[PDB]
From a paper:
DltB, a model member of the Membrane-Bound O-AcylTransferase (MBOAT) superfamily, plays a crucial role in D-alanylation of the lipoteichoic acid (LTA), a significant component of the cell wall of gram-positive bacteria. Through biochemical analysis and cryo-EM imaging, we discover that Streptococcus thermophilus DltB forms a homo-tetramer on the cell membrane. We further determined the cryo-EM structure of the tetramer form of apo DltB at 3.42 Å resolution, and DltB complexed with DltC at 3.50 Å resolution, and in complex with an inhibitor m-AMSA at 3.23 Å resolution. The tetrameric organization of DltB provides a scaffold for catalyzing D-alanyl transfer and regulating the channel opening and closing.
To understand how the DltB inhibitor m-AMSA regulates DltB activity, the structure of the DltB tetramer complexed with m-AMSA was solved by cryo-EM. The high-resolution electron potential density map (3.23 Å) of DltB/m-AMSA enables us to identify 4 m-AMSA molecules that bind to each protomer in the tetramer unambiguously, with methane-sulfonamide group deeply heading into the active cavity of DltB. m-AMSA binds to the extracellular surface of DltB, at the bottom of the outer surface funnel where the active His336 is located. The sulfonamide group is embedded between the active residues His289 and His336, and forms a hydrogen bond with Tyr345. Interestingly, the m-AMSA binding pocket is formed by an aromatic cluster, consisting of Tyr128, Trp335, His336, Phe403, Tyr345, Trp285, Trp288, Phe250, His289, Tyr253, Phe400, and Phe247. In addition to this aromatic cluster, a few residues with linear side chains such as Leu246 and Asp249 are also located on the surface of the binding pocket, enhancing the interaction between m-AMSA and DltB. The binding pocket is relatively rigid, as m-AMSA doesn’t significantly change the conformation when compared to the apo-structure.Fig. 5 m-AMSA binds in the L-tunnel to inhibit DltB. The local resolution distributions of the best DltB/AMSA map demonstrate that the core of the transmembrane part has better quality, at 3.1 Å resolution, while the loops extended out of the membrane have a resolution of around 3.9 Å due to flexibility. The high quality of the density map allows for de novo model building of the entire molecule chain, from residue Met1 to residue Lys415. The inhibitor m-AMSA bound to the L-tunnel of each protomer blocks the active site. Our cryo-EM structure of DltB with m-AMSA provides a solid structural basis to target LTA D-alanylation for treating gram-positive pathogens.
Author numbering:
A (entry chain D), B (entry chain C), D (entry chain B): -3 to 415
C (entry chain A): -1 to 415
The structure:
């Protein structure tokens, strides 16, 4: 019973997901039949299960091919703890059973995030897309608590959780929407619109990830980091340069990936949620989070923020609504900080964005009451000309870039602050 | 530039039939046109012949490239002795002429299976698929003898015998079914169903041959063989491990090949006979042989067993039907053992399966008699609960695995008897 | 490391330099033409392809001109939109002049910098000479009110048109926009594709065969012989004059046919540059055939406006004197547009005096023909000999003008430069 | 001038026609618009000229790039001497003017064939496909003499004489048939049939030229030539082997080229004359020349043989028809040998085939009169069965292979000279 299985895995091809442009040749041909079927309102179940698995495995057979075994564990784990809840949801419905099942479904993510904190080495049950997979898994469990979801076969569950395009780090979806958009193949005109948008997304992804992302990440970021470290100190102008360059590099690389993922999803007939919709023209933090990482932000708003507000109002822990809203903002953003990894700078990012949202809500209330004061006194309301818009965009852009510097992790390198 | 023809043949590319997964890329592309042409009612004869010859030659080259010549001679031999009988078939059917023609059709296989035993290593005319091509040749001399075949062209004959997806060691076929199947191209929906089933077969063959066959073949079997040899003796627990692991490895590897062959055959518009339909769950040995290697077992039942029973009843040599059935069982299984190869363990395998079949038949007769005895005595008949079925399945599974241990030739290493 | 050296590292593809460039262009522009067949336009794909090929054409040995292109784009956007906001209110007849001057300012700086110190200014790049003409066009089309509303997409799609850009035919905004909006039907698209293939073939013949023969086989040795023999005039001077004239035509017409072909592959029929110029009977009929786009641009926006301005102030006594002065000034402005050297200005003034002499000769011929018809004498016949004489004299004068424009007289002589 | 243009012509890209399988990717992508336009009943006159000129130039820009200049002369020659007849044909029809114009049109071929005899070096006017273009450019004059041809534009003349596929060494056509097939674009069903036949021809051309021609020409022919030269003498077994191998190599290489040319022609909507139609089952010399090099043989039969027979019968030079037929056979085959080139072995080939045809006609007459003699005497007519047909096949095959040995020029090496 020799254990050379790991070395067997570290031999397969390693076609990187959305790596070289030539990838979109292979994938394109691999997606040529499926799309054709949609034109005849015919869906090939087995062929999709073949292409999705082949490309997932090709994406996961890298230097750390062992993660495949972890994946083959993870899936099984979810099948154990989703279906279990379904059985329970047929008969009884208690808060503590739902909480336990949510915790047990999200436990692999908790282990992957916490193990480096304790051991210092990556956990065994960690693979490429786990952070963006439990979101689907636990998502389904939440839908069973509300009663929205009642029946689903294993084929639907596994084709939803393991969606090929949005697997590595892609838009976070929901089961209800994905299933409803999977059942009803769009008519020919909508399918043609989807094909045109997919080609446009592929071209823009080429531009974003292979040109602008490369310029901002492999040409300016390393020398800027080196100069900032060499000058040293608490802060310096090269740190401002690296902050802005990293913000733009992060945005362009992630937008390129998201455009690729949405294009490949459209080629399969499913419209995955968008990720970025002009995030930098946002003139406010609350308007920013409706532009930046749309899928993740909306997921945390629907399932972690709204539910917490409902829980807090159920027990009326806080008297006024504003205090409860601020507390929910802080807790939601802190949980979003943990999700990235339990280090010092991710928690700082979460607390910083939570404080930003609370400050923005307070300023909205103060602006409203100041407008009331000026209107009652007969004076004109506060200006809303181009200058106020420019000031708001400038403040939002600066705060967002500060957040992307803190999230960058460069603040460890600049000053070795352990905690 | 050439030297000897054998060296030039060795220089040619070698593609193991269903070896690395990339093989299915080649075939896929090579079968991309033909299958599309199947949707309409047209077939590309030249393209099919060229691709079939290409892949047969690629599978035949390598270290044993000289066998290609052994193929060509073989083909001519069949064309000499099939067509000859055709002419004779139009005049009269004398039994001895039919026997002579069948013998001369199977003569290359007789030489291949009898040459290494006498003094040599391998006969010259031996090549890769001769074991599973004689069945497609002597399957015509019989069909003419019964008159179900009267007219056919050389194109049909050499397109049926040299079927590319079923050449090396594949599902044995019959001429009448194959020809009548290739004449009538299926409809559009049937073709889509066949494509979906072909993709399912490809995936399941991947699992059966590149994972499970690898696990049971090169991970457990060599260490278990080493432990069994080191412990020595008549038998040991490592020998039992070898038995079970080799049986599962044989089933998984062969079912992987057979699913690959059925998939590639479906991609060319022909549904080749299925080899395995859930073995290891057979209650009886008689039910086992309707599930394990279905194509060959059915071939021997139709053309070796039933004909033997008909011959024995024609001369009424034996007193009753039961004796004829038992003798036919023994002789048919001995002929199967001979077909595998003239060694002590193959003949032991054939005799073992024959004794199993006759004992199963005797047990069925005795059970029917005792059920009649209980019915006439008023007692409730013998139980048929889940426990009895489980016991029957367990007994059949153990007997089959013992037969596969004998067929493995491992007992030759473990005992060195009859060396 | 990212510097100007990074820009210089980028691949370089001289526009219409080798046939493989046309293979690249055909492969790139096939989807656009196929989409045009179905009356649909791929806005993002066209922009990406145009930017790609502009960058490839600009990333030469001196690839530091891309920064100049970006600065020029920003400058033109700023001033065009500054006028657009201002035009809707009122036109002061001097703010229009200021905006036109500030739109031609990069070009005038580029054409005046090498004269002053030693070299061209920083903001010089490849197509700046044939891009200003587009920008000023818009300003003109705002002063007369024929243009009122347009978006930044239309403006930057018209100005940075990839097929022409470098030296291609000069377009106008009104015609270009009305042509871009209305995709032609399928039969006209097929006719345009066939004409594009014909243009590609004829451009091959003109630029890669005839231009090579007249520029690499005869011109260098003829120049060497002319320099060796020396003197004001010589037979090698005639050789270099004729060879350079034919080289200029067979190279520029080849480039313009390439540009029209590539433009037709994107659904727009750019103005034709040459319509068989060497058969022009008169000097005035030569400019309707030689560099048609530029000559028509100067006639419409520099000549006619100058005549209208002079007439509305009635500075001169009669119409013919105004026409002569407008001819001379327009051709001098054309020479200046080419570059501030002695021979370019000599070329401009030469063409101006040629046009005015042609006009005077036509008027004198009309008067003398009227007198002869009054006297009963038959007018001078023109069947094959007079027309041949006119064609020959116009061809000789044009070839002399191209000798002057060549700058070869700068090498042959050493006049004050 | 400088005169370096030839060196310029040598730096152009080179692409041997039908040299590599990758060449057909370029050819198919270039010819796709023409085929689509055919499907819509449209011909793009300019685009066809562009693709034809580009591929002619790519075929002619080899080490002998200077031949392009010769080609540019050849066209300018032929035009001058085609229209010089077209103007004359309308006015007067003296025989000697037609003879003079035909001679002047064929003069470049005469110079290319004669100058190596005198000077010993290839002539300036020689280029790749002059021998298969003079045929078209003299066929137009021959048609014009008969009055079959009338007003024709220069576009038709130059698109006929310079056909892109059948240019280097391709099927020899006629103007009337080519023009009539150019005007009437086939229907959609005929276009589909042409596409199928073009793909079949391309595949068979791959097989014939890149596999079988390579086997017979680059692996067996050099060793057989070396052995035959080493043994020496008038005749030897290696020389017989080289005779048969060269015959098969010539047939396979030429048939591969002809299938390629017919395929590319079908992709343009024009079906050029076939070149080979089962040559080796001829059973006779006449049935061979009606099967071997169909285009060239039919051209020489229509314009050089029939015309000479008509001339001889016009002046009744010989007493009987058989003598005139034999003389015409000999003269036609001598002119064919001359067309191949003025050496000893080409003229020997021509006179050998002429004698073969004459004795075949004598054999037919003698067989007919012997059959008449036997019928008059009441005896059974001479047999015509499998054995007689096999004897005829054997005799014709041996004579044809001897002819291809003489045409090979190998007899010049082995027999004459020294080595
Ligand atoms: C009434 C009495 C007089 C009648 C005369 C009838 C015949 C007159 C024919 C005169 C025109 C012949 C034009 C071509 C002759 C030479 C062609 C030849 O030999 O073939 C060369 C080219 O190959 C061809 O033959 C190409 C095909 C053309 C065949 C002839 C076409 C014209 C036929 C016209 C027949 C007209 C009959 C009368 C009609 C009323 C091969 O090159 P070479 O180097 O071997 O040339 C020969 C060598 O130099 C010895 O001089
Ligand atoms: C369902 C139909 C379609 C299925 C997919 C069809 C396409 C499949 C392509 C598989 C091969 C991809 O080919 C790709 O080649 C690249 C570049 O050479 C190689 O690249 C890889 O090499 C090895 C793994 O082999 C890794 O250590 C390396 O880091 C990685 O770059 C791999 O060999 C393979 O990742
Ligand atoms: C230390 C923690 C981080 C500090 C974070 C600082 C960022 C705080 C939020 C950004 C500043 C918001 O401050 C100001 O808000 C007002 C009031 O909505 C915005 O004003 C706008 O608000 C909304 C748009 O969403 C509209 O309804 C309104 O009409 C418009 O005026 C201004 O554009 C912005 O300048
Ligand atoms: C490496 C092994 C090489 C051995 C194989 C050699 C290739 C096999 C040769 C096939 C024989 C070719 O000869 C064949 O003759 C038969 C007899 O009519 C005809 O064959 C035809 O048979 C039937 C008749 O309807 C058709 O359905 C079929 O599609 C067609 O092939 C053709 O004429 C020709 O295809
Ligand atoms: C030494 C080599 C030989 C060893 C193997 C011998 C054969 C192995 C099987 C022996 C019998 C086991 O089979 C056991 O009995 C019979 C045989 O069909 C089955 O039962 C059978 O008999 C009765 C009716 O006749 C019904 O129950 C049923 O319709 C039928 O299948 C049992 O459900 C099965 O459990
Ligand atoms: C979405 C885009 C679709 C458009 C299709 C793709 C167009 C862009 C890719 C083409 C890039 C060509 O890339 C360029 O090719 C030229 C062609 O000689 C070569 O260029 C190199 O050699 C040439 C001449 O030999 C020199 O003049 C040049 O300075 C040097 O860089 C290089 O290979 C590369 O610089
Ligand atoms: C090499 C240097 C290149 C410099 C940059 C060149 C590109 C500059 C940006 C081009 C786009 C600017 O145009 C801005 O974008 C949007 C989104 O497309 C345009 O939107 C629209 O533009 C035009 C206007 O009808 C439409 O034809 C087009 O289909 C649509 O995109 C807006 O009109 C404008 O707000
Ligand atoms: C740089 C110095 C100037 C260079 C030369 C510039 C002038 C060159 C052209 C001068 C001649 C004008 O060219 C002249 O054009 C007119 C009108 O088009 C033609 O035709 C005219 O004259 C002919 C003479 O029979 C008559 O038909 C009629 O009077 C009129 O049509 C003349 O045949 C041609 O000679
Ligand atoms: C509308 C017209 C469409 C035209 C389609 C495209 C035509 C152009 C084809 C590509 C240009 C020629 O591409 C050709 O490629 C071959 C590939 O060996 C190379 O050419 C080669 O020719 C010969 C044999 O082939 C070699 O011995 C030689 O060393 C090399 O020059 C060059 O790279 C180029 O001559
Ligand atoms: C230097 C001379 C080179 C030429 C060499 C000979 C070339 C071959 C031509 C000779 C004829 C061969 O082809 C000949 O055809 C005739 C009539 O068709 C047939 O002739 C034969 O069969 C016929 C029946 O048909 C019988 O009368 C008899 O057995 C015999 O004459 C044979 O098929 C073959 O003998």
């Amino acid at each position: 019973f020799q254990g050379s299985m790991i070395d067997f895995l570290k031999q397969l091809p390693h076609l990187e997901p959305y790596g070289n442009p030539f990838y979109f040749i292979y994938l394109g041909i691999a997606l040529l039949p499926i799309f054709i079927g949609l034109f005849f309102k015919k869906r090939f179940a087995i062929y999709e299960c073949l292409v999705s698995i082949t490309f997932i495995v090709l994406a996961l057979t890298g230097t750390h091919a062992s993660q495949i075994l972890a994946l083959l564990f993870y899936i099984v784990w979810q099948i154990i703890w989703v279906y279990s809840y379904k059985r329970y949801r047929s008969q009884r419905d208690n808060k503590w059973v739902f909480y336990l099942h949510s915790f047990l479904v999200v436990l692999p993510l908790i282990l992957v995030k916490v193990e480096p904190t304790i051991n210092g080495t990556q956990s065994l049950l960690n693979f490429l897309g786990i952070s963006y997979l439990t979101f689907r898994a636990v998502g389904m469990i939440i839908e069973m608590r509300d009663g929205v979801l009642k029946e689903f076969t294993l084929g639907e569950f596994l084709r939803f959780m393991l969606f090929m395009p949005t697997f590595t780090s892609g838009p976070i979806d929901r089961f209800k929407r994905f299933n409803e958009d999977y059942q009803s193949i769009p008519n020919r005109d909508e399918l043609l619109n989807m094909l045109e948008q997919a080609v446009k997304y592929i071209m823009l992804g080429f531009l974003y990830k292979f040109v602008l992302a490369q310029i901002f990440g492999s040409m300016l970021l390393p020398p800027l980091k080196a100069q900032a470290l060499s000058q040293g100190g608490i802060f310096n102008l090269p740190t401002l340069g690296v902050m802005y360059v990293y913000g733009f590099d992060l945005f362009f690389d992630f937008a390129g990936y998201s455009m690729f993922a949405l294009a490949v999803s459209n080629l399969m007939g499913i419209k995955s949620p968008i990720n970025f919709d002009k995030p930098f023209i946002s003139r406010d933090m609350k308007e920013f989070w409706n532009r930046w990482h749309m899928s993740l932000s909306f997921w945390f708003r629907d399932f972690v923020f709204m539910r917490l507000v409902i829980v807090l109002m159920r027990n009326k822990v806080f008297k006024n609504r504003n205090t409860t809203s601020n507390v929910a903002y802080i807790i939601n953003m802190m949980v979003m900080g943990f999700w990235h990894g339990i280090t010092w700078y991710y928690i700082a990012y979460g607390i910083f964005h939570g404080i930003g949202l609370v400050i923005n809500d307070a300023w909205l209330r103060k602006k409203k009451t100041i407008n009331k004061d000026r209107k009652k006194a007969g004076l004109k309301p506060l200006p809303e000309n181009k200058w106020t818009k420019a000031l708001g965009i400038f403040i939002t852009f600066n705060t967002v870039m500060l957040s992307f510097l803190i999230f960058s992790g460069f603040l460890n390198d600049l000053w070795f602050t352990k905690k």
